[PDB]
From a paper:
Methanothermococcus thermolithotrophicus is the only known methanogen that grows on sulfate as its sole sulfur source, uniquely uniting methanogenesis and sulfate reduction. Here we use physiological, biochemical and structural analyses to provide a snapshot of the complete sulfate reduction pathway of this methanogenic archaeon. M. thermolithotrophicus activates SO42− by conventional ATPS and APSK, but transforms it further by uncanonical enzymes.
Numbering used by the authors:
A (entry chain B): 1 to 110, 119 to 248, 254 to 557
B (entry chain C): 2 to 102
C (entry chain A): 1 to 556
D (entry chain D): 2 to 103
The structure:
């Protein structure tokens, strides 16, 4: 194996929406900066944007302000958000939409939000702009841990899955932009269609796990976003009209506010109470309207076309069935992830984060993730100004990470595969930590079982054996998700209230509780190998 | 998920540089192969990359797929989609890259 | 392929509990009768008894009578059972237990020589070799057996059953078995719904995963009437390993508790089998699960006795306890519900039969878990039905002779139907794929585990149409060998059974059996529905048609 | 489910005549093979039948199996069960055929 030491000024882990904009913004600030992206897959399509987008959801119309955005975000989730993070995102949403147009995204008219787009190639256009800016990219390269020196992050380790190479990447500052975590719970269709899900099945919590292993603080893992999407194909609903139950009743009219959480809650009630399935009532649209729908879905979720063809579904005659996904651990549509300051610096010196990997501010969307990448990289650039990558890393520490990364490749005694352990984990979380099978409900006794069962899975990781570097990537996805899952269980155990309906359904503490208007954070103690909960008080945003 | 029609595949390798899951690789004989069809997200990136429509997307029979398929051919300014129903009837849908919805 | 024509007097389909006893009893009545069992697997261990059984659960202990047996069986359905069928079983239960002892089953006895009661209607045994003992007795009676031979359809001359078609999975052979009378003893159906653990552990279930409703499907295709497929028995068993609970509950006298340690059954007036399951579901749904059998505080000797008992009938639990570090004296035993099964032993779904166990088709009798109308049957009740059916079949065949001639075109039609996917070069689906597709449909739209067993009209109407689309795709299946051909026929049969289940569930607009038949849009029991819902398959329309049969008081 | 330890299997075929699912067959070289381990019901009929204990039952990892195994030796009047836990610790339990429980 060839061990390669690389040096860069700014290292970005993950070349998705936030990481691409961070790298572009860095080059725009200083052409001379060395900027390197380490990307698990292929930057042209990597991350949540691979299939395309339905729309640009987050920007401000005339007369709307960051304050308007903060209030929307609180209405779409709860009052317990990091207002400072939401406000500073809000200030740049419109600027980020303008950059997407500059990069080549097709946009047309019919306020400002009334635009027509083709989001099919949003990721390629973002990737092309990144490479045109002079950013260096290591594709098909999996990050596995931060390089720490005296409690300061000064790089990261990674291994290639196409070459026999292990990378020691020294950097003056590191930006985590790996996205959130899927695959902790069972998906809607385990087995044959186990990766038909809403979030990317290839964002498996690496950023969360590297952060936890390195000592960084996470926040609000008990808030698990669940998507309400077209059944089985998990396609967007925005494209597609009102919500109806199987009796044809517009059941949302029974509730005062029609918010994203409410639409999911209401749909679950209808099904549980015997009036499902629930649907988007497309009946009565025109033949041309059907053709428009087909063309739009081909540009961002083509599987639904195959479902319609197979099941003889014409949306003008048959409404579109919807249902909820597995719970995800995300800081884009949810508010789970790294705990950061207003400059997107994590709790570790030298490490910043942006996007779905950052907690505290739900309803970020593409523009919000792009904006966070800019904020983070601007802070990192100011931080690296004085220093230089002269940190010397002891060969023993390098060898230790190598041993950890490649352990199952040299495990002749192993008896389990990553896929077997992944399914075992998903079963534990689905059954004892509030998955689909429990209609997302959690209670203390089951959570305590989940805690103990996850520890037994962790013990069996040393019995995993892999045959190649691709299966080695899968092993690390499982290692990372087990740690994230252990944190999720501790967060769910700790918050003895129900703050977010569906996303955090503590059936044994069903009421909201004013005594719990505070943030629940976690830290991983490498000495005791236990997750430790930290309370952080809520702070009104008052910049002076 | 997707299938590679090896008789149509010309071994160009293009589909192996797009997948967000790293699922596609070029075998020694030049043909593309998917590591595990169960891990496909149906993002269609590979389908659109193939210049000879040797990659087709279909819904897993286990979740109700009946054999309908989706193929895609990229032009200088559009994507031409070929949708074949479960009885073999083909519908051709061209979506211009500049077309907005 | 070898097409083998065989002639027999009595043909028995399925060499399980009912089939074995039917065959033995036939040879008792007339040793010169040619009796032949067609068995899908290996008779030594085939069927629900393969792993052993925990006890004999239908036995009239001292003070108990056939009349009191009926009174107890009646309770769960609020009296809607076939009392004639239950009573005639009750009159033979103790005889069947004595037969098992004569065949060699170890049955515990007290100093007086009486069987040792375990519960009101059960007795203690070592049941590990119950099926080998039954099979040995069958072969020693001179009964002929075709093992590894799959029955696919009855032979019908006009509306009279006069044999059956079957294929071997070990030889390139197809059987045309002419019989004076046929007795269907194939057991019920599992694998219609999704199991507790799809995929890697998909056959970890309570009922035999190899009883896939062939008897129901053969009967439906031949024109016979089925009954009460809307009553889908669901087992409350040890979680994941699906092990018996009676050994812990009845044997140790332990209570059901929630995760708070509360004996939640005390909140309910009646502690019946369906209510034990319903109450467990409620506890979990309301955030007080998991639920358990409280073994805490038993002795080390009791733990050892439990391990030996479970090794003798459900060994998987020992592995779970070792892997998860469960000692029952310190940690209670977690319990949960299974998939719904279509069975006439623990439930009351199956063929509609007269008191002599004749189906609605002349020449065809049925016995055991394949027969509806009488729950709480168990192994002795199934044996009893085998005897009743064969006694009537023997009286019926007394007049006739195997002079019926089948037309060669009819044989050719069944051969083409049976071997179609083996010759389907253009096929594109496997039996496994279609099986998973069907289980998903039923789980999501016909009240499987994922909906907590609840059904509503709208979902069932969807299930009806989705099952029809699966049937359309059966012609797109290909198989590569005779073993996979058997799996194809398991799917074909289960699709037809599932279509019937859906129609029955749609038709009964009330909730009579909690859990087993939860019509949430008609949540109350309704005296206007005190009647049997039956079905037949219309081959001209390819549809299931519902028939109502009135309840008739039984007076002996 | 079950696994066949091929190095121990002597190719006798006995395990191929008991399974209620027809899951076990003899290959060209005589050793036993299971058609699909996912279809096993864990009835243990094959485990008991094998005279050299080349068949061991174990719980699928996907449902929480950690490596404990069960083997069984039939005697003239008993079954001798060999239970090995996930750390290799062995417990042997004989259950006499004529012994009844409780
Ligand atoms: C199906 C779907 C549809 C959506 N549609 C819309 C829409 O219409 N409009 C809208 O505004 N928003 C939409 N969103 C939201 C938006 O896509 C996400 O919030 C945003 O893409 C997240 O950006 P990110 O940079 O945090 O993560 P990503 O864009 O997912 O990027 C994360 C990157 O990290 C990489 N990575 C992961 N692990 C590692 C590792 N170990 N080493 C190296 N790299 C790694 C990944 O490969 C990826 O390139 C959608 C999201 C989804 C899932
Ligand atoms: C797990 C379990 C534990 C039980 N424990 C007890 C207990 O402790 N006490 C008690 O009293 N009762 C018990 N029972 C109930 C009792 O075992 C059943 O009620 C009884 O065995 C059913 O008998 P049967 O003849 O109808 O079906 P089975 O005994 O299952 O026999 C059906 C036969 O049909 C064969 N067959 C299926 N399809 C075909 C085909 N196409 N062609 C040919 N043959 C076919 C099968 O291979 C099998 O040999 C238990 C049942 C189960 C499932
Ligand atoms: S459709 Fe997307 S996830 Fe699936 S193989 Fe192609 S590129 Fe990969
Ligand atoms: S892009 Fe198409 S032709 Fe080229 S290797 Fe892939 S499947 Fe084959
Ligand atoms: S344990 Fe039972 S079901 Fe499994 S292979 Fe052995 S005999 Fe067959
Ligand atoms: S019984 Fe045992 S030794 Fe004989 S073939 Fe089967 S596994 Fe091999
Ligand atoms: Ca996965
Ligand atoms: Ca099956
Ligand atoms: Na029209
Ligand atoms: Na087709
Ligand atoms: Na057809």
């Amino acid at each position: 194996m060839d061990v390669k030491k690389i040096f860069t000024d700014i290292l970005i882990i993950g070349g998705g929406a936030a990481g691409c904009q961070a790298a572009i913004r860095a080059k725009e600030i200083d052409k001379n900066l060395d900027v390197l992206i380490v990307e698990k897959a292929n930057i042209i399509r990597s991350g949540c944007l691979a299939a395309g987008v339905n729309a640009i959801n987050a920007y401000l119309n005339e007369g709307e302000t960051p304050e308007s955005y903060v209030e929307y975000v609180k209405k779409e989730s709860s009052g317990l958000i990091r207002e400072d993070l939401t406000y500073t995102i809000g200030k740049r949403l419109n600027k980020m939409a303008k950059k997407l147009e500059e990069y080549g995204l097709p946009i047309q008219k019919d306020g400002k939000r009334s635009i027509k787009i083709n989001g099919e190639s949003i990721k390629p256009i973002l990737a092309e702009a990144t490479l045109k800016a002079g950013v260096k990219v290591l594709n098909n390269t999996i990050a596995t841990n931060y390089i720490l020196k005296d409690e300061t992050v000064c790089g990261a380790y990674a291994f290639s899955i196409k070459e026999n190479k292990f990378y020691v990447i020294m950097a003056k500052a590191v930006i985590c932009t790996t996205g959130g975590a899927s695959g902790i719970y069972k998906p809607n269709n385990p087995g044959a269609a186990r990766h038909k899900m809403w979030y990317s099945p290839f964002n498996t919590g690496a950023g969360f796990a590297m952060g936890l292993r390195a000592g960084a603080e996470m926040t609000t893992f008990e808030m698990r976003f669940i998507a309400l999407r077209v059944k089985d194909v998990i396609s967007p609903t925005g494209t597609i009209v009102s919500q109806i139950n199987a009796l044809g009743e517009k059941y949302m009219e029974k509730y005062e506010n029609n918010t994203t959480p409410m639409r999911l809650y209401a749909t679950l009630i209808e099904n549980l109470e015997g009036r499902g399935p629930c649907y988007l009532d497309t009946r009565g649209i025109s033949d041309e309207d059907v053709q428009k729908l087909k063309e739009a879905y081909l540009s961002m979720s083509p599987g639904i076309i195959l479902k319609w063809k197979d099941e003889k579904i014409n949306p003008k005659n048959t409404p579109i069935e919807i249902c909820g996904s597995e719970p995800y651990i995300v800081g884009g549509h949810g508010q789970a992830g790294y705990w950061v300051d207003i400059n997107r610096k994590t709790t570790l010196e030298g490490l910043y984060a942006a996007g779905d990997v950052v907690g505290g501010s739900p309803k970020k969307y593409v523009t919000g993730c792009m904006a966070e990448g800019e904020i983070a990289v601007e802070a990192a650039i100011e931080y690296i100004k004085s220093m230089e990558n002269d940190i010397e890393i002891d060969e023993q520490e390098i060898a230790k990470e190598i041993d950890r990364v490649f352990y199952p490749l040299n495990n002749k005694k192993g008896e389990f595969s990553p896929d077997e352990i992944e399914e075992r984990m998903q079963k534990v979380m689905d059954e004892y930590a509030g998955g689909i099978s429990s209609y997302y409900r959690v209670n203390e006794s089951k959570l305590l079982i989940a805690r103990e069962l996850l520890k037994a899975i962790e013990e069996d990781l040393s019995k995993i054996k892999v045959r190649n570097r691709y299966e080695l990537m899968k092993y690390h996805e499982v290692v990372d998700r087990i740690l994230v899952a252990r944190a999720v269980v501790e967060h769910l155990l700790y918050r003895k209230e129900t703050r977010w309906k569906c996303y955090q359904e503590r059936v044994d503490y069903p009421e909201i509780d004013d005594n719990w208007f505070k943030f629940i954070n976690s830290k991983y103690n490498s000495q005791t190998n236990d997750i430790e909960i930290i309370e952080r008080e809520y702070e009104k945003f008052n910049p002076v | 998920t997707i299938r590679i029609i090896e008789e149509i595949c010309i071994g160009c390798g293009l589909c192996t540089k797009v997948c967000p899951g790293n699922l596609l690789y070029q075998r020694e004989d030049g043909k593309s192969e998917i590591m595990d069809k169960r891990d496909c997200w149906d993002c269609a990136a590979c389908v659109k990359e193939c210049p000879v429509n040797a990659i087709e997307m279909y819904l897993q029979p286990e979740i109700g797929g009946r054999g309908s398929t989706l193929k895609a051919k990229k032009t200088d300014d559009s994507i031409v989609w070929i949708i074949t129903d479960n009885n073999g009837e083909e519908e051709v849908i061209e979506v211009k890259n500049k077309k907005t919805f």
